[PDB]
Amino acid sequence: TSQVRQNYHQDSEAAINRQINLELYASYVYLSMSEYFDRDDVALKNFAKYFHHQSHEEHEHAHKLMKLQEQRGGRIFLQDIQKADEDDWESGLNAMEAALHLEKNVNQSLLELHKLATDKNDPHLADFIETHYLNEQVKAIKELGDHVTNLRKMGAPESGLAEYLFDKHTLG
Amino acid sequence: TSQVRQNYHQDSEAAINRQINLELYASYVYLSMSEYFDRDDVALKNFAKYFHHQSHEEHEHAHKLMKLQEQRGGRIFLQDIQKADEDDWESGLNAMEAALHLEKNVNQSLLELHKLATDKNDPHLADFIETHYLNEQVKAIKELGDHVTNLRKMGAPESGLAEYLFDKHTLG
Amino acid sequence: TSQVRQNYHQDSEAAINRQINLELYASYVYLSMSEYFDRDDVALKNFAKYFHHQSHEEHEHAHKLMKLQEQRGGRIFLQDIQKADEDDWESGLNAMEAALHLEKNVNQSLLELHKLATDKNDPHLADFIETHYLNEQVKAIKELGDHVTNLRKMGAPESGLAEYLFDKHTLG
Amino acid sequence: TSQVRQNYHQDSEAAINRQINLELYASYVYLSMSEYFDRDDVALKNFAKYFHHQSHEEHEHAHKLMKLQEQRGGRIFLQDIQKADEDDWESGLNAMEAALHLEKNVNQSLLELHKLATDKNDPHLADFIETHYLNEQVKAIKELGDHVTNLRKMGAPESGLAEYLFDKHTLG
Amino acid sequence: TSQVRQNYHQDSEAAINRQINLELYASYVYLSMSEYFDRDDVALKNFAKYFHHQSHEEHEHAHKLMKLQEQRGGRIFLQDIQKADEDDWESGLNAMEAALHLEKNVNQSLLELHKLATDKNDPHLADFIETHYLNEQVKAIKELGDHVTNLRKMGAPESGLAEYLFDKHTLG
Amino acid sequence: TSQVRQNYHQDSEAAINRQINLELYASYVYLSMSEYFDRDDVALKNFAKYFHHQSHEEHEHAHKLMKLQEQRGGRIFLQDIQKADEDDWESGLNAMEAALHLEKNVNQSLLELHKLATDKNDPHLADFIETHYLNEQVKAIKELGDHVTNLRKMGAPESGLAEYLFDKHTLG
Numbered sequence A, B, C, D, E, F: 001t002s003q004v005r006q007n008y009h010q011d012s013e014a015a016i017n018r019q020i021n022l023e024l025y026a027s028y029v030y031l032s033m034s035e036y037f038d039r040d041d042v043a044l045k046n047f048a049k050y051f052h053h054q055s056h057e058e059h060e061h062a063h064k065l066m067k068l069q070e071q072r073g074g075r076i077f078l079q080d081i082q083k084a085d086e087d088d089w090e091s092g093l094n095a096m097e098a099a100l101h102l103e104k105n106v107n108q109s110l111l112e113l114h115k116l117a118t119d120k121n122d123p124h125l126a127d128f129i130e131t132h133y134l135n136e137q138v139k140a141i142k143e144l145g146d147h148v149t150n151l152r153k154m155g156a157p158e159s160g161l162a163e164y165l166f167d168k169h170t171l172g
C-alpha cells in the first residue's frame, strides 16, 4: 500500500481507472469525427477544427484523472482505447447528435462516480469530480444541444448549404 | 556538351522541356478562368482572385523547372503556350471541376517524369520532382476537390446564391 | 450584348484581343531572353534579372488590356502564345537589339490601335492607350536604345569584358 | 472512388491505416511511461515530462498520416489503440530500453511501408515517409541509445542516485 | 553491434567513411587555393575569401556525414587527408576550373553512394544524400561553371585585368 | 625570390611549413576525439563540444601561420594531414590525457621553432611565436591538466558517473 494512500477505497480506485479509459475513448471518438470532416467529399474545415479541439479537451480530462490516481496513491491500470461505433459520421448534424449522446453518457458515468465517492465518504474525490468535471459536462452538453438546434432549424442534414453556413458562422 | 552536365540523360532534358510547357499551359488556363470571373455577367471577384493566384503559382512552377534545366546543363527549348479548351467556363463549379482535371493531368505528367528519372538513375532529378512538385500537386488536387464538394453540396451550379456565398466565405 | 456595352465597336473589341496576345508574346520573348542569360555558358545574371523584370511588366500590360475588355463589355478571346524567333540570343547586345525591335513593333500595333479608336470615335479607348501605353513604349524604346548604344561603344559583342562590365554597372 | 484519388494503391491505403494505429499505440506506450514516473514511489518528474513530450510527438506523427490518407483520397479506418505490454516500467533505464525497442519496431514498419510505396511506384508516398518519418526515427533511436548508455554507465538501474541525477542533468 | 543499428549495411558504413574523407579532401583543396590567392605575387583577396568559404562549407559537409555515421550506429574510421595535386594554382581561371573538376568528382562519388543505398534498400541514407548533398553539388557545379565562363569571356587568364575586375565585381 | 622577402631564412620557411602541418594534425586529432564522444555507446555531448571547439582553435592556429608565411614572402607547402593514433579514445579521462600529451608535443615543436628564429636572428618570427603561440600552449596545457586532475579525483575512468558529472558541471 502507498505511503500517501488515505481514505481511498479500492472501488474508487477501480472506478477512476474506468473513467480514465472512458475519457480516452471520448477523445478518440472526437478525433474520428475531426478527420471525417477533412475528407475531400465532406470538406467542412471548421467542423474538423471544432472536433479536434474537443478531442484534446477530453485528453486533458483524462490527464487530470490520471493525476488524481497518482496523488491519492492508487495505481493506474490503462485499458485498450476502443475505436468509435462509426467510421462514417454522415453529416455535420449527425456528428453533433452523436457527440451530444456521447457527452451525456460520459456525464452519467461521472454522476455514478460521484455517488460512489459520496457512498465511500470520500469528500476529496467528490469535490474533484464536482470542480473539474460536472459543470464542464453540463456546459458541453448545452453547447452541443445549441449546435444541434441551429443545424436542424437551418435545414440540416438535407441542406448542405445549412451545414456550410453553420461551419462558417458558428464554428469559424 | 555543357561544362556542368553530369548524369543528365537526353530523354530527361527533353521531358523537362515538355514539363516547362505544361506548367506554362496550366498557368494560362488559370489566367483564362481568372478573367472569366471578372466578366460583368459573371462578377465573382474572389473566384477571379483565386484563379489569378493559381496562375502565378504555376508560373513559379515553370520557373523552378527552367532553373533546373540550366543548372543541369540542359538547353531550354520553349514551345507555344496553347490557349485553353474553353473561353466560357460556365460557372464557379465547372471551373473548379476543370481545374481539378487539369491538376490531375499535370500530376500524371510529373509521375511519368519521376519514373523516367528513376529509370535513368537520376536521383537529383527524382528528388527535385519529389521535393518541389509531388506534394504540391497532392495539396492542390485535395483543395480543388474540397471546393468542388462544397459548391455541389451548397447547390451549385444551379444556385447562383451558392456560388455567391462560396465566393464570399471560402475564397474571400 | 453586354448590359455595360456602350460606344464599343466590334473592330475595337477584336483589336484589343489581338493586342492582349501581342503583350503576352512580348512577355514570353523577354522570359526566353531572361533564361538565356542564366545559362552556364552565358552567365550574365543582371541581364537575366533585367529581362525577367521586362517579362513581368509586359504581363501587367496584358492585364490592363484584359481589364479594359471586361469593363467595356467586350469578350476576351485568348490565343496561343507563340514562342520567340530564337532559342539562342547570341549576346547581351543582340538581345538588347532584339528587344528594341520588339518594342517598336508593339508600339506600331498600339499606334494602329489608337488610330482605330479615333476612327471609331471611342475617346475612352483612345485615352486608355495614351495614358497607359504610348509613353511607356516611348520610355522603353529609349532605354533599350541607351543600352544598345553603351554596349556598342564599350566594344560588344566581341568584347565579353564589355558585356560583363555593363551587366555589373548599368543593370546591377 | 475519390475525385482526388490518383496513383494510390489499395495496399498502400491499408498500410497507411495500419501505420496510423501503430503511431497511436506508440503515443499510448509513452503516456503509460509518463504516468509511471509520476508515481509517489517512483517520483522522477523529468522522466515523466520527457515521455509526455514523446507521447504528443507520436500523436503528431499520427496526425500527418491521417492527413496523408485524406489528401490522397484514401479512407481512414481507425482501430482499437492497444494498451502497452507493461503497467509497471521498473526503472528509468528499463523504460528507456523499452522505448528504444518500440522506436526500432516503428522504424521497421516504416521501412516496410517505404518498400511498398517503391514497389507500387508511388513516389509521393515514398517521399512523404522519407521527409517526415525516416530521419525522425533515426534521431529518436539515437537519442534513446544515448540515454540508455548514460544511465548504464552511471550505474542504473541498481543506483537510484544515477537515475535521480540523470533526471536532473539530462532530462531537466 | 550497435544498440541503434538498423537496416545499415556494412558496405554503406564503409562508403560513408570514404565519403567523409573525400569531403575533408575537398575542404583541403579549397584551403590550398584560398592561401594561394593571398600570395604577394597573386594578391586576389576576394578569390581567397571565396575559396576559404568553400573550404568551410566542405567541412560542414563532412560534419553531417560523420553525424549520419554515429546516428546509424556505424563506426567512423578516419583516414589521412591527402594534400592537393598542386601547390601553385596558376590563375583565378585555373583554380575555378580545378574547383569545377573537383566538385564533379565529389558529385560522381555521391551518385555512386546513392546507388549503393538504393541497392541495399536503405531509403534513409538515400534521402539523406538527396536532401543534403545532391542539389548542393548541382548548385556548386553551376556556380563554378558560371565563374569559369565569365573569366574566359573577360579574357582570363592572359588578362590580369580580367581576373582583378572579376575579383572586385563578382567575388567582392 | 619574393619582392617582400626580408631577413627570412630558408630554414625558418621550412620550419613554418612543418608547424602548419602539425597544427592541422592537432586539429584533426581533436575532431576525431569530438566525434568519438558523439557515439551512441559513449554519449558525452559536452566532451564532444569541448573537443570540437579545440579542433577549430587549432585550425585558427594553422591560419595565422599560413598568413605569416605569405606575409614574409615564404611559400606554403602543404602536406598530408595524418589521421590520429586512435579511432577509439576509450574514455573521457584518456582523451584528456591524450590531448595533454598532444599539446605538450606541439609546444615542444614551437619552442624549437622559437630557438631557430633566435638562432637566425629573426626577431619578427620570434615575437610572432611568443605573442600568438607560447602562452596559448601554456594555458591549454594547464587547462587539460586541470581536467585530467578532476576526472582522476572523481574516480574516472572506472566511474562512468564521474565522467557524466564532469561532462555536465565543468564542460557544460
Ligand SMILES: [Ca+2]
Binding pocket: A082, A083, D080
Ligand atoms: Ca474493438
Ligand SMILES: [Ca+2]
Binding pocket: B082, B083, C080
Ligand atoms: Ca492552338
Ligand SMILES: [Ca+2]
Binding pocket: B080, C082, C083
Ligand atoms: Ca508556333
Ligand SMILES: [Ca+2]
Binding pocket: A080, D082, D083
Ligand atoms: Ca487488448
Ligand SMILES: [Ca+2]
Binding pocket: B127, B130, D127, D130, E127, E130
Ligand atoms: Ca526524397
Ligand SMILES: [Ca+2]
Binding pocket: E082, E083, F080
Ligand atoms: Ca600523399
Ligand SMILES: [Ca+2]
Binding pocket: E080, F082, F083
Ligand atoms: Ca598515414
Ligand SMILES: [Ca+2]
Binding pocket: F127, F130
Ligand atoms: Ca616579445
Ligand SMILES: [Cu+2]
Binding pocket: A052, A055, A056, D059, D063
Ligand atoms: Cu490532435
Ligand SMILES: [Cu+2]
Binding pocket: A023, A026, A057, A058, A061, A062, A106
Ligand atoms: Cu471528458
Ligand SMILES: [Cu+2]
Binding pocket: B052, B055, B056, C059, C063
Ligand atoms: Cu497575372
Ligand SMILES: [Cu+2]
Binding pocket: B023, B026, B057, B058, B061, B062, B106
Ligand atoms: Cu504547376
Ligand SMILES: [Cu+2]
Binding pocket: A169, B169
Ligand atoms: Cu455570411
Ligand SMILES: [Cu+2]
Binding pocket: B059, B063, C052, C055, C056
Ligand atoms: Cu517570372
Ligand SMILES: [Cu+2]
Binding pocket: C023, C026, C057, C058, C061, C062, C106
Ligand atoms: Cu507591353
Ligand SMILES: [Cu+2]
Binding pocket: A059, A063, D052, D055, D056
Ligand atoms: Cu498529454
